[PDB]
Write a protein that binds this ligand. Structure first.
Ligand SMILES: [Mn+2]
Ligand SMILES: [Mn+2]
Length: 133
């Protein structure tokens, strides 16, 4: 039930190195119903952006929304998720299958690119968690 705008962001300090995720669930009247930031251990930049997507999807599914608008600032996640790009990387393939499994739970979905400054809150959640690692 209901629409949510789900922001997500990864942070990582190596290839791989210490990494974290951040995510924010907004209603349409603009309330932050839930948000999160967590350390995830060692991961690449691209892994952390995916892991933040998946954490956002899991939170939105938990809250039982039926219509999700994903908002993030990772080209690689967007292009792969929408099928514009593919990858050989079996790990990122698995993360896409997981994201798509989660998406199948919503009646409708979308994804939109926002500049990182627009994604400031998810970015702050990820980085504050990472700064504490
Ligand atoms: Mn990002
Ligand atoms: Mn960021």
């Amino acid at each position: 039930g209901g629409r949510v705008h789900a922001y997500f962001d990864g942070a990582s300090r190596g290839n791989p190195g210490p990494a974290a995720v951040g995510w924010v669930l907004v209603s349409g009247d603009g309330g932050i119903v839930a948000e999160g930031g967590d350390t995830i251990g060692r991961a690449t930049n691209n892994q952390a952006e995916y892991d933040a997507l998946i954490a956002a999807l899991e939170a939105a599914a938990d809250f039982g929304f039926d219509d999700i608008e994903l908002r993030g600032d990772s080209q690689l996640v967007e292009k792969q998720l929408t099928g514009a790009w593919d990858t050989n990387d079996p790990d990122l393939r698995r993360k896409r299958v997981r994201a798509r499994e989660l998406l199948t739970g919503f009646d409708d979905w979308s994804i939109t690119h926002v500049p990182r400054a627009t994604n400031e809150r998810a970015d702050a959640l990820a980085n504050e968690a990472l700064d504490d690692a």
